[PDB]
Symmetry: C2
Subunit: 172 residues, 2 copies
């Protein structure tokens, strides 16, 4: 099968863990007909804990899941552990302030590093999603997200993207 089955009942869950970056993401994912819930107060341990329980959940009717973490633990989503998401996309957008990764299939991890409209990674990632999110596959979408941050910087930190997606992700 070429394409991720992205015509389920529901699109899926968007947990945005933390001001204006959190908002746009929100706007845009909502326009991607995600259900978006926003977690303030940061701390490490809540995020983890929350993610535990979000993995605990019957996702049989969701195209994917999206977990954002915006600054200014995986084993929970593996197919064995989260079989309701197995060969479904599981998207990870981190904006950190050095990290390891492997393993598993259908994972994706967009990762920038921050130092009035906010960070460049988020400005571009939303400028893209919210213009071509439904037109382009995620991996060229995000590629151009790389090009626009590279490139709109200077007038007078690039996203690092790492994908195990076993198919073409289209927001249909």
């Amino acid at each position: 099968a070429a394409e991720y089955n992205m015509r389920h009942k529901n699109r899926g869950m968007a947990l945005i863990f933390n001001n204006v970056d959190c908002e746009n993401l929100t706007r845009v994912l909502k326009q991607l007909d995600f259900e978006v819930t926003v977690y303030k107060d940061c701390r490490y341990k809540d995020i983890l804990r929350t993610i535990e329980y979000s993995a605990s959940q019957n996702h049989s009717d969701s195209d994917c899941i999206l977990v954002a973490i915006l600054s200014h633990i995986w084993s929970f989503f593996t197919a064995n552990h989260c079989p309701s998401l197995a060969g479904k996309p599981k998207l990870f957008f981190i904006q950190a302030c050095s990290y390891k990764i492997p393993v598993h299939a259908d994972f994706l991890i967009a990762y920038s590093t921050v130092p009035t409209r906010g960070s460049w990674f988020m400005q571009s990632l939303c400028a893209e999603l919210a213009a071509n999110g439904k037109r382009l596959d995620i991996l060229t979408l995000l590629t151009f997200v790389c090009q626009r941050v590279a490139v709109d910087f200077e007038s007078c930190q690039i996203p690092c993207i790492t994908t195990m997606l076993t198919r073409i992700l289209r927001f249909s």
Copy 2:
């Protein structure tokens, strides 16, 4: 639909230069079919393939340093390919790690201005004891792509464990859609195939543009 996406420059890597670019395939041997397939496919794709068989990792790094130093003005791109062998491990001297650690600086747009805005591809075959983090630290530079898989560095099983699935599939894809298809939907299907054959390929891009060997 990319007809009409650009970005404050352009959509698709300029892949119509005079030459495609170098392929440097380094066999990490200790004390081959993969390494020949690779070779072939990269020749079908128009690369100038040289195949090194060395054993002191430092050799592999330096050989890389000196090719960074070349003028790839007439190059589409470059490809470096490190292949480590199944089920025995290796030893490395005190200054290798560091040396690995550096070797990306050599290729930045600053350090290597004949490849500024050109794809610098890397394929790593590594051991299931090495690390990958962003042991192989993901550089974080524009235009890099590192396709990365782990080879098992110990023993058992009978049907003598084959040529890597990463390489069987990568050659298979490249070798079929290499020219039909853009790199990331290639390396997406290379992932599919080694997963729908049950250590799955871990691709990490900073490509600023759509790469297609046209």
